[PDB]
């Protein structure tokens, strides 16, 4: 249930991503890691939805 959605996007920038996820009322989890920094992960089966909502942020 942990995948890199972003790379090195700090909390101020991640606020964009967490917002679009939270807006649709989906399991949105904020993950910290070394190669990742700050990113947003979602429920494992809902992986498609996470990436889907970020398509409008590309």
Helix H or strand E encompassing 31: strand 28-33
- Phi, psi of 15, deg, nearest 5: -60, -30
- Technique employed here was NMR
Contact 27, 46 (CB under 8 A): yes
Report the DSSP beta bridge partners of residue 37: 33
Contact 56, 19 (CB under 8 A): no
Domain boundaries of the chain, sorted by first residue: 1-58
State the Cα–Cα distance between residues 34 and 14, nearest whole angstrom: 16
Topology (CATH) of 1-58: Alpha-Beta Plaits (3.30.70)
Strands 37-42 and 28-33, bridge-based pairing = antiparallel
Q: Which residue has the tokens 């949105």?
A: 28
The angle subtended at Cα 29 by Cα 54 and Cα 49, nearest 5°, is 35
> What are the tokens at 17?
């991503």
């Amino acid at each position: 249930k942990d995948k890199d959605l972003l790379k090195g996007l700090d909390q101020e920038q991640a606020n964009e991503v967490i917002a679009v996820l939270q807006m649709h009322n989906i399991e949105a989890n904020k993950i910290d890691s070394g190669k990742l920094g700050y990113s947003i992960t979602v429920a494992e089966p809902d992986f498609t939805a996470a990436v889907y909502w970020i398509k409008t942020y590309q």
